């Protein structure tokens, strides 16, 4: 997804939303295996920690503070980046880096 | 005895001098000076000096009060004497219709009360006296001065005073000015004041007394990298609300991060822009960083990194920054950085337009206008090396 | 990730104690339990605890006359006492020759002490195993808490009011003890504990099992 | 949703639905002066430009 | 004791918010009653070509004048619109005193 | 204009201690700040405009609402002969 449209992701909010959702779903799959999904019992440690420290080693694009906007004025007319939405999880102020910042934008 | 007298005289003079001096700019110094000179044998003199000063700056009454308090803490007798003198003065004022004097004295008293020198009882008495003769102008300012304090200590007394004031306002044919004063007082209340034989021994005592008296960086990096657009990153940074000290450091870190990435990204530039718009301190920090770069940190970098940096700077400068730039000897890495920056500018702006913009700013370093004995030749050559105009024109101009 | 996945700060997990062990599971977590069982197969927890007790006894025997010890009685506790986390009991009761001047309830790693508070003729050691977990992995604190609880309320099957609660976090390999001490005891005790941690057979076995589980 | 801007609903989302207002927003708002830096320049560029009844 | 305190923390206000899918930031939030059918289709009404933006029209104002500021309100109850409560209680054990306020002119 | 959600806002601010009321019986009109008949005018579409161009923007909006101006961008001027007297003699 990201290597194909590196630069072009940032603007599209729907895609971002999907990523957030998709990532969460994936996480829950793992948590489904462990028959819980209790949000404390899976700190981001267990997912994003690499396999070389025993983690799953996911490559998140979910911890981004998504651009929210006036959906009144978004589809209509014009736009600007104001009010960020949550992004994906409760964090312990643990800023998980995002794959996009390690991919050189197409231009 | 003669010697003692002389000493006293000297002391008095010193006190007078201190009084004359006393201001906000050199208060500590004044205090120090005062401490140096004796005021047990020359206690009366000191008192006289203080009182005189009060009579004079009335605006620096608080300071005087503080000084008195300080003195009192050490030598209480002197303080007591001063208080007595003040009281006497007040009495005199009351007697003789010396209104200004009364006001001054009252203020002093209030100050004393505030600093735990004199009791609030005296103040209360004064207020009562003022009331008895229908003198609103005297008690109004005094009350204001020692209002909160009064409330704290003798609340009942304060209440009584308030009641009296109210009575005066309503159950007495008061003047317009008086009424106004009353109103003001009320307003203040609503907010609670918003605005010798043993000479040698003594000397010895006084002298004794005188003698007695990486993680952050990491976090920043994470923030930079845990963020989709630059905007988000900027927002995150701003959330942190780091001190005006560390802004420069943050900027430096950001720059480093940018350098680290393989090629120049719009992201970093965007972030910078966001920061810059946000506050003057961030702008200042950015400027500082820039200065550091071309001066001392530019020659350290490898080429690609340097180029990237230049590009970033160009982007910053194409719009957001003011074109302020400080540029034979200075030509290796630095020159290439400059070239890169120029290229970036060209890309952003448009050649002629860019040139015009450059002209508009003072700009002596990038394009020095004065010929200066074939020193501009080098600059021209450099310009030629990276496709540019106006250099030729400049050359023609000088001959 | 057991020590995060199973942990104390759970929202709604019904805390079952796992079979023949002191390993609380906050809710049915699937593979974890099996792994734990494998680790602690053949009553391993009990063995560990008992082994530790034995070691302590041996140590005491070695240093009898140095610390003025009349007799070192290992009490005949109920087999599950190792893994009864609610209650407790004095494992190694300890008779004195002369009267000990013990300190106030304090930790095993404390440089500053005062041996003029309480006095006693009899003492006890309790060994308390626990399986740690990310939230409550601090062992010392836990032991202190236990001491505060057990010693005070009604009767906690201790013959003397004064004693010590040794505690070994099996899942973090941390150890700490807390309680009352007499002069020269504490350093020795610490040393003994260290030795045990380095090499107790049961503990070693446990470690091996854990390794196997983890691969 | 607060000022037309929050995420419609907390469910589905797969997220807190928390909404920090951005501090880029402020920046975006504020460049009246920045417009003058450009606006001002523009202005400068184009700056120079009955009796019977009575 | 001041009743006016509960402005936009009324049950009615809450209900309105729920209806309008509009959180008073302090208060609760729910699944919207009605699904947000974003099918304006760039019409000549409510366009940004047409309207003016002196006021930001906060969602605070929505639940206060539901039928006005919000367009297509549904199942929206009417809120209250109140008087101010000058009520002074003495905490220092005193009796009938003009303390917090100021005296008449005459 | 500015008095949209004024009272409510005030109430929110003041924890319902101050109660505003707005009225218009003085019939007191006033110049909208800024200057109509300016084609440069303002920057923002979404935000509130600046005060020199405030008059203009409002007028434009009104025109749009009416259906006087035809399109996304337009102007206002006098219809007369001779190119409006040569743009008022330049």
PDB file of C-alpha atoms in Angstrom, chain B residues 132-362:
ATOM      1  CA  UNK B 132     -16.080  61.106  63.147  1.00  0.00           C
ATOM      2  CA  UNK B 133     -15.251  64.278  61.139  1.00  0.00           C
ATOM      3  CA  UNK B 134     -16.814  62.998  57.846  1.00  0.00           C
ATOM      4  CA  UNK B 135     -13.377  62.778  56.149  1.00  0.00           C
ATOM      5  CA  UNK B 136     -13.849  60.318  53.263  1.00  0.00           C
ATOM      6  CA  UNK B 137     -10.712  61.384  51.326  1.00  0.00           C
ATOM      7  CA  UNK B 138      -8.339  60.412  54.176  1.00  0.00           C
ATOM      8  CA  UNK B 139      -9.698  56.976  55.167  1.00  0.00           C
ATOM      9  CA  UNK B 140     -10.445  55.799  51.583  1.00  0.00           C
ATOM     10  CA  UNK B 141      -6.828  55.438  50.417  1.00  0.00           C
ATOM     11  CA  UNK B 142      -5.630  54.173  53.797  1.00  0.00           C
ATOM     12  CA  UNK B 143      -8.308  51.478  53.774  1.00  0.00           C
ATOM     13  CA  UNK B 144      -7.280  50.435  50.266  1.00  0.00           C
ATOM     14  CA  UNK B 145      -3.649  50.232  51.357  1.00  0.00           C
ATOM     15  CA  UNK B 146      -4.410  48.100  54.435  1.00  0.00           C
ATOM     16  CA  UNK B 147      -7.639  46.403  53.262  1.00  0.00           C
ATOM     17  CA  UNK B 148      -6.778  42.752  52.650  1.00  0.00           C
ATOM     18  CA  UNK B 149      -4.484  42.765  55.681  1.00  0.00           C
ATOM     19  CA  UNK B 150      -7.250  44.271  57.809  1.00  0.00           C
ATOM     20  CA  UNK B 151      -9.673  41.602  56.613  1.00  0.00           C
ATOM     21  CA  UNK B 152      -7.160  38.888  57.475  1.00  0.00           C
ATOM     22  CA  UNK B 153      -6.451  40.183  61.004  1.00  0.00           C
ATOM     23  CA  UNK B 154      -9.376  42.215  62.407  1.00  0.00           C
ATOM     24  CA  UNK B 155     -12.272  41.088  60.208  1.00  0.00           C
ATOM     25  CA  UNK B 156     -14.915  42.384  62.614  1.00  0.00           C
ATOM     26  CA  UNK B 157     -13.249  45.800  62.641  1.00  0.00           C
ATOM     27  CA  UNK B 158     -13.181  45.834  58.841  1.00  0.00           C
ATOM     28  CA  UNK B 159     -16.872  44.938  58.736  1.00  0.00           C
ATOM     29  CA  UNK B 160     -17.660  47.747  61.171  1.00  0.00           C
ATOM     30  CA  UNK B 161     -15.702  50.202  59.030  1.00  0.00           C
ATOM     31  CA  UNK B 162     -17.600  49.072  55.936  1.00  0.00           C
ATOM     32  CA  UNK B 163     -20.907  49.538  57.752  1.00  0.00           C
ATOM     33  CA  UNK B 164     -19.874  53.037  58.811  1.00  0.00           C
ATOM     34  CA  UNK B 165     -18.941  53.882  55.227  1.00  0.00           C
ATOM     35  CA  UNK B 166     -22.309  52.611  54.011  1.00  0.00           C
ATOM     36  CA  UNK B 167     -24.089  54.732  56.612  1.00  0.00           C
ATOM     37  CA  UNK B 168     -22.121  57.790  55.516  1.00  0.00           C
ATOM     38  CA  UNK B 169     -23.043  57.126  51.891  1.00  0.00           C
ATOM     39  CA  UNK B 170     -26.774  56.615  52.529  1.00  0.00           C
ATOM     40  CA  UNK B 171     -27.754  58.089  55.928  1.00  0.00           C
ATOM     41  CA  UNK B 172     -25.795  61.355  55.421  1.00  0.00           C
ATOM     42  CA  UNK B 173     -25.896  64.112  52.766  1.00  0.00           C
ATOM     43  CA  UNK B 174     -22.425  63.401  51.358  1.00  0.00           C
ATOM     44  CA  UNK B 175     -20.607  65.345  48.623  1.00  0.00           C
ATOM     45  CA  UNK B 176     -20.128  64.085  45.043  1.00  0.00           C
ATOM     46  CA  UNK B 177     -16.410  63.429  45.480  1.00  0.00           C
ATOM     47  CA  UNK B 178     -17.099  61.666  48.777  1.00  0.00           C
ATOM     48  CA  UNK B 179     -19.740  59.504  47.104  1.00  0.00           C
ATOM     49  CA  UNK B 180     -17.299  58.606  44.334  1.00  0.00           C
ATOM     50  CA  UNK B 181     -14.668  57.662  46.909  1.00  0.00           C
ATOM     51  CA  UNK B 182     -17.182  55.468  48.728  1.00  0.00           C
ATOM     52  CA  UNK B 183     -18.102  53.754  45.463  1.00  0.00           C
ATOM     53  CA  UNK B 184     -14.429  53.124  44.718  1.00  0.00           C
ATOM     54  CA  UNK B 185     -13.944  51.637  48.181  1.00  0.00           C
ATOM     55  CA  UNK B 186     -16.943  49.361  47.663  1.00  0.00           C
ATOM     56  CA  UNK B 187     -15.543  48.221  44.318  1.00  0.00           C
ATOM     57  CA  UNK B 188     -12.187  47.475  45.938  1.00  0.00           C
ATOM     58  CA  UNK B 189     -13.912  45.456  48.655  1.00  0.00           C
ATOM     59  CA  UNK B 190     -15.749  43.440  46.008  1.00  0.00           C
ATOM     60  CA  UNK B 191     -12.377  42.332  44.500  1.00  0.00           C
ATOM     61  CA  UNK B 192     -10.405  42.371  47.836  1.00  0.00           C
ATOM     62  CA  UNK B 193      -7.584  44.772  46.829  1.00  0.00           C
ATOM     63  CA  UNK B 194      -6.576  43.635  43.321  1.00  0.00           C
ATOM     64  CA  UNK B 195      -3.779  46.225  42.960  1.00  0.00           C
ATOM     65  CA  UNK B 196      26.024  57.528  75.385  1.00  0.00           C
ATOM     66  CA  UNK B 197      28.073  55.712  78.058  1.00  0.00           C
ATOM     67  CA  UNK B 198      28.020  52.251  76.428  1.00  0.00           C
ATOM     68  CA  UNK B 199      28.903  53.599  72.960  1.00  0.00           C
ATOM     69  CA  UNK B 200      31.809  51.259  72.237  1.00  0.00           C
ATOM     70  CA  UNK B 201      29.760  48.233  73.278  1.00  0.00           C
ATOM     71  CA  UNK B 202      26.909  49.336  71.020  1.00  0.00           C
ATOM     72  CA  UNK B 203      29.319  49.764  68.114  1.00  0.00           C
ATOM     73  CA  UNK B 204      30.725  46.287  68.698  1.00  0.00           C
ATOM     74  CA  UNK B 205      27.214  44.831  68.759  1.00  0.00           C
ATOM     75  CA  UNK B 206      26.275  46.577  65.524  1.00  0.00           C
ATOM     76  CA  UNK B 207      29.349  45.308  63.685  1.00  0.00           C
ATOM     77  CA  UNK B 208      28.552  41.753  64.786  1.00  0.00           C
ATOM     78  CA  UNK B 209      24.985  42.142  63.538  1.00  0.00           C
ATOM     79  CA  UNK B 210      26.242  43.472  60.207  1.00  0.00           C
ATOM     80  CA  UNK B 211      28.607  40.526  59.838  1.00  0.00           C
ATOM     81  CA  UNK B 212      25.759  38.110  60.571  1.00  0.00           C
ATOM     82  CA  UNK B 213      23.597  39.661  57.804  1.00  0.00           C
ATOM     83  CA  UNK B 214      19.510  12.645  25.186  1.00  0.00           C
ATOM     84  CA  UNK B 215      16.133  11.287  26.288  1.00  0.00           C
ATOM     85  CA  UNK B 216      14.503  14.516  25.121  1.00  0.00           C
ATOM     86  CA  UNK B 217      16.241  14.220  21.756  1.00  0.00           C
ATOM     87  CA  UNK B 218      15.048  10.631  21.411  1.00  0.00           C
ATOM     88  CA  UNK B 219      11.489  11.690  22.212  1.00  0.00           C
ATOM     89  CA  UNK B 220      11.668  14.443  19.602  1.00  0.00           C
ATOM     90  CA  UNK B 221      12.942  11.969  17.017  1.00  0.00           C
ATOM     91  CA  UNK B 222      10.094   9.589  17.830  1.00  0.00           C
ATOM     92  CA  UNK B 223       7.576  12.403  17.453  1.00  0.00           C
ATOM     93  CA  UNK B 224       9.052  13.339  14.084  1.00  0.00           C
ATOM     94  CA  UNK B 225       8.856   9.726  12.931  1.00  0.00           C
ATOM     95  CA  UNK B 226       5.509   8.883  14.591  1.00  0.00           C
ATOM     96  CA  UNK B 227       3.595  11.278  12.405  1.00  0.00           C
ATOM     97  CA  UNK B 228       2.121  11.098   8.941  1.00  0.00           C
ATOM     98  CA  UNK B 229       2.292  14.675   7.626  1.00  0.00           C
ATOM     99  CA  UNK B 230       4.684  17.278   8.906  1.00  0.00           C
ATOM    100  CA  UNK B 231       1.668  19.157  10.249  1.00  0.00           C
ATOM    101  CA  UNK B 232       0.874  16.371  12.706  1.00  0.00           C
ATOM    102  CA  UNK B 233       4.494  16.271  13.845  1.00  0.00           C
ATOM    103  CA  UNK B 234       4.472  20.032  14.373  1.00  0.00           C
ATOM    104  CA  UNK B 235       1.285  19.773  16.421  1.00  0.00           C
ATOM    105  CA  UNK B 236       2.820  17.035  18.553  1.00  0.00           C
ATOM    106  CA  UNK B 237       5.907  19.171  19.142  1.00  0.00           C
ATOM    107  CA  UNK B 238       3.737  22.114  20.161  1.00  0.00           C
ATOM    108  CA  UNK B 239       1.809  19.909  22.587  1.00  0.00           C
ATOM    109  CA  UNK B 240       5.072  19.337  24.448  1.00  0.00           C
ATOM    110  CA  UNK B 241       5.332  23.125  25.017  1.00  0.00           C
ATOM    111  CA  UNK B 242       9.070  22.957  25.707  1.00  0.00           C
ATOM    112  CA  UNK B 243      10.755  26.054  27.134  1.00  0.00           C
ATOM    113  CA  UNK B 244      12.189  28.862  25.008  1.00  0.00           C
ATOM    114  CA  UNK B 245      15.609  27.519  26.023  1.00  0.00           C
ATOM    115  CA  UNK B 246      15.099  24.161  24.289  1.00  0.00           C
ATOM    116  CA  UNK B 247      13.431  25.390  21.100  1.00  0.00           C
ATOM    117  CA  UNK B 248      16.806  25.814  19.399  1.00  0.00           C
ATOM    118  CA  UNK B 249      17.803  22.303  20.460  1.00  0.00           C
ATOM    119  CA  UNK B 250      14.548  20.924  19.065  1.00  0.00           C
ATOM    120  CA  UNK B 251      15.153  22.717  15.773  1.00  0.00           C
ATOM    121  CA  UNK B 252      18.671  21.288  15.599  1.00  0.00           C
ATOM    122  CA  UNK B 253      17.320  17.793  16.235  1.00  0.00           C
ATOM    123  CA  UNK B 254      14.748  18.249  13.476  1.00  0.00           C
ATOM    124  CA  UNK B 255      17.468  19.390  11.080  1.00  0.00           C
ATOM    125  CA  UNK B 256      19.568  16.347  11.958  1.00  0.00           C
ATOM    126  CA  UNK B 257      16.591  14.067  11.339  1.00  0.00           C
ATOM    127  CA  UNK B 258      16.007  15.702   7.961  1.00  0.00           C
ATOM    128  CA  UNK B 259      19.664  15.213   7.055  1.00  0.00           C
ATOM    129  CA  UNK B 260      19.449  11.550   8.031  1.00  0.00           C
ATOM    130  CA  UNK B 261      16.651  10.853   5.480  1.00  0.00           C
ATOM    131  CA  UNK B 262      17.982   9.866   2.034  1.00  0.00           C
ATOM    132  CA  UNK B 263      16.629  12.927   0.198  1.00  0.00           C
ATOM    133  CA  UNK B 264      14.856  16.177   1.047  1.00  0.00           C
ATOM    134  CA  UNK B 265      11.248  15.704   2.171  1.00  0.00           C
ATOM    135  CA  UNK B 266       8.501  18.302   2.140  1.00  0.00           C
ATOM    136  CA  UNK B 267       7.425  17.015   5.555  1.00  0.00           C
ATOM    137  CA  UNK B 268      10.245  18.629   7.527  1.00  0.00           C
ATOM    138  CA  UNK B 269       9.749  21.900   5.659  1.00  0.00           C
ATOM    139  CA  UNK B 270       6.031  21.816   6.425  1.00  0.00           C
ATOM    140  CA  UNK B 271       6.759  21.184  10.097  1.00  0.00           C
ATOM    141  CA  UNK B 272       9.178  24.110  10.166  1.00  0.00           C
ATOM    142  CA  UNK B 273       6.586  26.364   8.549  1.00  0.00           C
ATOM    143  CA  UNK B 274       4.003  25.324  11.122  1.00  0.00           C
ATOM    144  CA  UNK B 275       6.427  26.040  13.955  1.00  0.00           C
ATOM    145  CA  UNK B 276       7.446  29.370  12.445  1.00  0.00           C
ATOM    146  CA  UNK B 277       3.869  30.591  12.056  1.00  0.00           C
ATOM    147  CA  UNK B 278       3.063  29.516  15.606  1.00  0.00           C
ATOM    148  CA  UNK B 279       5.453  31.840  17.467  1.00  0.00           C
ATOM    149  CA  UNK B 280       8.209  34.459  17.309  1.00  0.00           C
ATOM    150  CA  UNK B 281      10.411  32.451  19.669  1.00  0.00           C
ATOM    151  CA  UNK B 282      10.358  29.519  17.258  1.00  0.00           C
ATOM    152  CA  UNK B 283      11.270  31.860  14.402  1.00  0.00           C
ATOM    153  CA  UNK B 284      14.171  33.154  16.485  1.00  0.00           C
ATOM    154  CA  UNK B 285      15.294  29.594  17.204  1.00  0.00           C
ATOM    155  CA  UNK B 286      15.159  28.760  13.500  1.00  0.00           C
ATOM    156  CA  UNK B 287      17.239  31.836  12.698  1.00  0.00           C
ATOM    157  CA  UNK B 288      19.800  30.825  15.314  1.00  0.00           C
ATOM    158  CA  UNK B 289      19.976  27.326  13.845  1.00  0.00           C
ATOM    159  CA  UNK B 290      20.500  28.762  10.369  1.00  0.00           C
ATOM    160  CA  UNK B 291      23.297  30.978  11.670  1.00  0.00           C
ATOM    161  CA  UNK B 292      24.945  27.987  13.336  1.00  0.00           C
ATOM    162  CA  UNK B 293      24.730  25.992  10.116  1.00  0.00           C
ATOM    163  CA  UNK B 294      26.356  28.236   7.519  1.00  0.00           C
ATOM    164  CA  UNK B 295      28.900  29.475  10.106  1.00  0.00           C
ATOM    165  CA  UNK B 296      30.069  26.393  12.058  1.00  0.00           C
ATOM    166  CA  UNK B 297      28.071  23.185  11.278  1.00  0.00           C
ATOM    167  CA  UNK B 298      27.962  23.297   7.431  1.00  0.00           C
ATOM    168  CA  UNK B 299      31.504  22.030   6.653  1.00  0.00           C
ATOM    169  CA  UNK B 300      31.001  18.868   8.782  1.00  0.00           C
ATOM    170  CA  UNK B 301      28.318  17.312   6.512  1.00  0.00           C
ATOM    171  CA  UNK B 302      28.783  14.983   3.531  1.00  0.00           C
ATOM    172  CA  UNK B 303      27.527  16.211   0.168  1.00  0.00           C
ATOM    173  CA  UNK B 304      24.062  14.685  -0.255  1.00  0.00           C
ATOM    174  CA  UNK B 305      23.116  15.624   3.306  1.00  0.00           C
ATOM    175  CA  UNK B 306      24.395  19.155   2.755  1.00  0.00           C
ATOM    176  CA  UNK B 307      22.369  19.439  -0.448  1.00  0.00           C
ATOM    177  CA  UNK B 308      19.253  18.266   1.374  1.00  0.00           C
ATOM    178  CA  UNK B 309      19.839  20.838   4.104  1.00  0.00           C
ATOM    179  CA  UNK B 310      20.251  23.577   1.507  1.00  0.00           C
ATOM    180  CA  UNK B 311      17.019  22.536  -0.182  1.00  0.00           C
ATOM    181  CA  UNK B 312      15.200  22.630   3.147  1.00  0.00           C
ATOM    182  CA  UNK B 313      16.567  26.099   3.859  1.00  0.00           C
ATOM    183  CA  UNK B 314      15.581  27.270   0.382  1.00  0.00           C
ATOM    184  CA  UNK B 315      12.048  26.018   0.979  1.00  0.00           C
ATOM    185  CA  UNK B 316      11.924  27.828   4.314  1.00  0.00           C
ATOM    186  CA  UNK B 317      13.225  31.017   2.701  1.00  0.00           C
ATOM    187  CA  UNK B 318      11.211  30.931  -0.540  1.00  0.00           C
ATOM    188  CA  UNK B 319       8.199  32.046   1.554  1.00  0.00           C
ATOM    189  CA  UNK B 320       8.323  31.905   5.354  1.00  0.00           C
ATOM    190  CA  UNK B 321      11.687  33.347   6.370  1.00  0.00           C
ATOM    191  CA  UNK B 322      12.959  36.845   5.698  1.00  0.00           C
ATOM    192  CA  UNK B 323      15.854  36.781   3.193  1.00  0.00           C
ATOM    193  CA  UNK B 324      18.587  37.640   5.680  1.00  0.00           C
ATOM    194  CA  UNK B 325      21.866  35.959   4.751  1.00  0.00           C
ATOM    195  CA  UNK B 326      25.470  36.357   5.957  1.00  0.00           C
ATOM    196  CA  UNK B 327      27.999  35.212   3.310  1.00  0.00           C
ATOM    197  CA  UNK B 328      37.287  33.844  -1.310  1.00  0.00           C
ATOM    198  CA  UNK B 329      38.174  31.935   1.877  1.00  0.00           C
ATOM    199  CA  UNK B 330      34.627  30.723   2.592  1.00  0.00           C
ATOM    200  CA  UNK B 331      34.241  28.292  -0.342  1.00  0.00           C
ATOM    201  CA  UNK B 332      34.100  24.529  -0.062  1.00  0.00           C
ATOM    202  CA  UNK B 333      31.072  22.764   1.431  1.00  0.00           C
ATOM    203  CA  UNK B 334      29.550  26.143   2.267  1.00  0.00           C
ATOM    204  CA  UNK B 335      29.659  27.340  -1.334  1.00  0.00           C
ATOM    205  CA  UNK B 336      27.935  24.180  -2.540  1.00  0.00           C
ATOM    206  CA  UNK B 337      25.280  24.554   0.163  1.00  0.00           C
ATOM    207  CA  UNK B 338      24.701  28.126  -0.997  1.00  0.00           C
ATOM    208  CA  UNK B 339      24.409  26.942  -4.597  1.00  0.00           C
ATOM    209  CA  UNK B 340      21.869  24.317  -3.568  1.00  0.00           C
ATOM    210  CA  UNK B 341      19.858  26.933  -1.682  1.00  0.00           C
ATOM    211  CA  UNK B 342      19.887  29.211  -4.722  1.00  0.00           C
ATOM    212  CA  UNK B 343      18.693  26.360  -6.929  1.00  0.00           C
ATOM    213  CA  UNK B 344      15.866  25.633  -4.499  1.00  0.00           C
ATOM    214  CA  UNK B 345      14.869  29.301  -4.494  1.00  0.00           C
ATOM    215  CA  UNK B 346      14.845  29.343  -8.293  1.00  0.00           C
ATOM    216  CA  UNK B 347      12.657  26.240  -8.358  1.00  0.00           C
ATOM    217  CA  UNK B 348      10.202  27.717  -5.889  1.00  0.00           C
ATOM    218  CA  UNK B 349      10.004  31.264  -7.200  1.00  0.00           C
ATOM    219  CA  UNK B 350      10.998  31.875 -10.793  1.00  0.00           C
ATOM    220  CA  UNK B 351      14.298  33.441 -11.802  1.00  0.00           C
ATOM    221  CA  UNK B 352      13.542  37.109 -12.468  1.00  0.00           C
ATOM    222  CA  UNK B 353      11.042  37.216  -9.605  1.00  0.00           C
ATOM    223  CA  UNK B 354      13.595  35.630  -7.276  1.00  0.00           C
ATOM    224  CA  UNK B 355      16.197  38.192  -8.322  1.00  0.00           C
ATOM    225  CA  UNK B 356      13.741  41.012  -7.657  1.00  0.00           C
ATOM    226  CA  UNK B 357      12.985  39.597  -4.213  1.00  0.00           C
ATOM    227  CA  UNK B 358      16.700  39.394  -3.439  1.00  0.00           C
ATOM    228  CA  UNK B 359      17.164  43.002  -4.538  1.00  0.00           C
ATOM    229  CA  UNK B 360      14.290  44.088  -2.307  1.00  0.00           C
ATOM    230  CA  UNK B 361      16.084  42.838   0.834  1.00  0.00           C
ATOM    231  CA  UNK B 362      19.328  44.597   1.933  1.00  0.00           C
TER     232      UNK B 362
END
